[PDB]
Design a protein around this ligand. Structure first.
Ligand SMILES: Nc1nc2c(ncn2[C@@H]2O[C@H](COP(=O)(O)OP(=O)(O)O)[C@@H](O)[C@H]2O)c(=O)[nH]1
Ligand SMILES: [Mg+2]
Lengths: 185, 320
């Protein structure tokens, strides 16, 4: 009370599983991440998601995931429990890693959540548009149409990528497209 | 070739005022005709600000200084704020004069004054005080707002105002956008070719809450805003300059309120301006994650102060 002298999509942005199914929304979130934070966690999560769904045969991907995110001097090295790292690395024996790679994905989830909460806070500050959120306006719950805006949006990323050295921007672009491609964009 | 500067900051930090200083200092200034156009805005500031005051006196249960003023409070409350002219923050001179007598009485009342001292509990700009204290000159029939009046007049900034000027053969373009949460969604339209960003903050807003949601601390909002701007890599080569505006108000406030009561982290003399100014500064630097950060203690309504501060800003930007 006391008069003044002058005077949703939050559902998609707060949950990673429904954010993954909405490429247009994901691209906006990847924009925030690549600009305001550590790309590692999320990018590692997505590639590892493509692996979990890719038919065992798959080897090449797993190999690149190790060098880009998990090994010693990885460009976008992500931090997971050492035990889980040693075990993933073993499965060298060219065995099935999906089981332990999924634990690695969960370990990094807390960080991905913090960043989710982080961007939602930014949306509250009314600054969602600073990350392409304005490209979501004319959308309606329809797979094909939404994933059409995914492109064009995915081109506005080079703008942020390019301001990263080659040993980091390269793997990033690799990571983004690996998942986008699996999402069909 | 062009120096494009963006003025960013939460609502009521001083952006529109800075923009007016540029026109006064480097542009054409405001001639009598252009100042005359602020009168409707000024009479609107006064009437609407006083209405907020009597309303707060009532709901906060603060007692009148004199019952006979209940009639004047009635007159004001009956003023329709949503009518066409009033809705756009304008009040004709003939209407203002009908309310002058009542307004003058209400402002001499200790109840209304106590309500003002507690404005942090609601929403009210201290610019209404400047005008209430000058009712004598706004009252006179042929009143023409002074430069200082124009600088104090308060008009919301819904939209994007752009102002072009020159300094020693160097073209400049300053952009002012609104700072209310709902206005910020437009901030992205002005980031093409930006050379520098002047981030303004009302240094005396530490005891206030947002107008958007009357539950979030103002300084807190500013810090979170600064945080998302200063850590955005896209602005890696953009000059970010921090203005701790309303220094003159902070100088008054530190003497009756303690920032300690709003931010524990504070350690030092809350009654001392220098101590609080440093804490504020550290608070904004503390948000960076890395490029140096230059800052300035300003008073947007003070022409001479903005004249020399901008001198430093220009040389800073011009040497990047
Ligand atoms: N006393 C004082 N008033 C100020 C200062 N800077 C701005 N103002 C006033 O504060 C109110 C809000 O200013 P404004 O420029 O509209 O803030 P904006 O919403 O960010 O554009 C206006 O009445 C200004 O005249 C200052 O340093 N001191
Ligand atoms: Mg403004």
């Amino acid at each position: 009370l006391i008069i003044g002298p002058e005077e949703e999509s939050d559902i998609i942005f707060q949950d990673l599983e429904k954010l993954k199914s909405h490429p247009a929304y994901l691209v906006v979130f990847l924009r925030y991440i690549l600009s305001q934070a550590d790309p590692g966690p999320l990018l590692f999560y997505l590639c590892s998601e493509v692996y979990q769904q890719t038919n065992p045969k798959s080897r090449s991907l797993g190999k690149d995931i190790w060098n880009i995110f998990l090994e010693k001097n990885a460009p976008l090295r992500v931090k997971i429990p050492e035990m889980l790292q040693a075990e993933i690395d073993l499965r060298r024996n060219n065995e099935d890693p999906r089981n332990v790679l999924c634990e690695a994905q969960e370990a990094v989830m807390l960080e991905i959540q913090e960043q989710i909460n982080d961007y939602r806070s930014k949306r509250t500050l009314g600054l969602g548009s600073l990350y392409g959120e304005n490209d979501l306006l004319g959308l309606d719950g329809d797979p094909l149409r939404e994933r059409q805006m995914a492109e064009k949006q995915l081109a506005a990323l080079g703008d942020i990528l390019s301001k990263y050295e080659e040993d980091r921007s390269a793997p990033m672009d690799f990571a983004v497209n690996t998942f986008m491609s699996h999402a069909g964009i | 070739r062009l120096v494009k500067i963006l003025l960013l900051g939460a609502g009521e930090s001083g952006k529109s005022t800075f923009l007016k200083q540029m026109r006064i200092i480097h542009g054409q200034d405001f001639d009598q005709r252009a100042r005359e156009e602020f009168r409707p805005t000024i009479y609107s500031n006064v009437i609407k600000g006083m209405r907020v005051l009597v309303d707060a006196r009532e709901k906060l249960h603060i007692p009148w200084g004199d019952n006979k003023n209940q009639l004047h409070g009635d007159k004001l409350m009956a003023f329709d704020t949503r009518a066409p002219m009033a809705a756009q923050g304008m009040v004709e001179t003939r209407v203002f004069l009908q309310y002058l007598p009542a307004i003058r009485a209400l402002w001499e009342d200790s109840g209304i004054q106590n309500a003002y001292d507690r404005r942090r509990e609601f929403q009210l700009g201290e610019s209404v005080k400047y005008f209430l204290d000058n009712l004598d000159k706004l009252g006179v029939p042929d009143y023409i707002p002074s430069q200082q009046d124009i600088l104090l007049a308060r008009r919301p900034t819904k939209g994007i105002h752009e102002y072009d000027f020159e300094i020693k053969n160097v073209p400049f373009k300053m952009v002012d956008v609104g700072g209310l949460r709902s206005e910020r969604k437009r901030w992205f339209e002005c980031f093409d070719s930006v050379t520098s960003i002047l981030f303004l903050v009302s240094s005396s807003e530490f005891d206030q809450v947002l107008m958007e949601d009357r539950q979030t601390n103002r300084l807190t909002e500013s810090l979170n805003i600064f945080e998302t701007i200063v850590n955005n890599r896209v602005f890696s080569n953009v000059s970010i300059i921090l203005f701790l505006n309303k220094t003159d108000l902070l100088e008054e406030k530190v003497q009756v309120v303690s920032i300690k009561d709003y931010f524990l982290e504070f350690e030092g003399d809350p009654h001392c301006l220098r101590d609080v100014q440093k804490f504020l500064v550290e608070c904004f630097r503390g948000k960076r994650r890395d490029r140096p950060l230059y800052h300035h203690f300003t008073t947007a309504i003070n022409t001479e102060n903005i004249r020399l501060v901008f001198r430093d800003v220009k040389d800073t930007i011009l040497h990047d």
